Amino acid sequence: ILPDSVDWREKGCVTEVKYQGSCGASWAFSAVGALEAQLKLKTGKLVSLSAQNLVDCSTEKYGNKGCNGGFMTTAFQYIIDNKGIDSDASYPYKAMDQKCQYDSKYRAATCSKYTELPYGREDVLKEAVANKGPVSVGVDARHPSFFLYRSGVYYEPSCTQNVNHGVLVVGYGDLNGKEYWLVKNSWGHNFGEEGYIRMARNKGNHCGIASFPSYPEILQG
């Protein structure tokens, strides 16, 4: 009963691709990316949320290490605990570790909960992308082919299921008989297909795309 193909960009739920630079904050970009879609669905407004807010404030208590890495799930937990996250406009991205400067005056979103999906279940991931929205995931990006990707459905024979880079699944589809996940990266427009990579789908959890998926929600109230 699920759609054969999904692309949440078609519903105006995905902000512009960002550029993380030399700061290892893909976990933070993946987290705000997922929440940006839920905020758009609830309020009608598409607003980039502050990845920097996560880097500076969702730190040791959440197991995160700022520009040295982190988790989307504990980023969501911080937003829940903190009762908000600032807009990127008010708290812009500097690709550096800074003191926490969260200001509730510029809160642009909240988070009520988040859900984790079972490891390696690409069918379950498909259902969530179709029925809930863009899903935060990790992938194994430690391959020159990933950095060098330009177009088409990416398949890396030496990929593993051990994730190391946070990204956002904003959809899925098929290209000339190859199924793919539509993945928003945080390496700017010049990476891949305008900042996106289409990654092999239903090929045994390729590059760990379904190893650790999660997504937040903003509930009425």
Ligand X SMILES: CC(C)=CC(=O)NCc1cc(-c2nn(CCCN(C)C)c3c2CN(C(=O)CC2CCNCC2)CC3)ccc1C(F)(F)F
| Residues that bind ligand X in the complex, under the rule CB under 6 A | 27, 30, 63-65, 69-74, 138, 162-166, 212
Closer residue to ligand X (CB): 50 or 214? 214
C-alpha dist (Å) from residue 87 to 37, 109, 110, 115: 14, 8, 11, 23
Radius of gyration of the chain (CA): 16
DSSP character at residue 49: B
Closest CA to 172 of 198, 196, 136: 198
What does DSSP say about strands 153-154 and 196-200: parallel, antiparallel, or unpaired?
A: parallel
List Cβ neighbours of 115 (8 Å cut-off, separation of 6 or more).
128, 132, 214, 215, 217
- Shortest Cβ distance from residue 149 to ligand X (Å)? 17
Closer residue to ligand X (CB): 43 or 147? 147
Closer residue to ligand X (CB): 65 or 143? 65
Cβ atoms of residues 6 and 168 within 8 Å: no
- Shortest Cβ distance from residue 141 to ligand X (Å)? 8
- Shortest Cβ distance from residue 74 to ligand X (Å)? 5
Closer residue to ligand X (CB): 19 or 106? 19
Closer residue to ligand X (CB): 89 or 163? 163
DSSP character at residue 67: G
- Shortest Cβ distance from residue 34 to ligand X (Å)? 11
Cβ atoms of residues 122 and 205 within 8 Å: yes
CA–CA distance, 14 with 30 (Å, rounded to integer) = 11
- Shortest Cβ distance from residue 82 to ligand X (Å)? 17
- Shortest Cβ distance from residue 71 to ligand X (Å)? 4
Closer residue to ligand X (CB): 45 or 61? 61
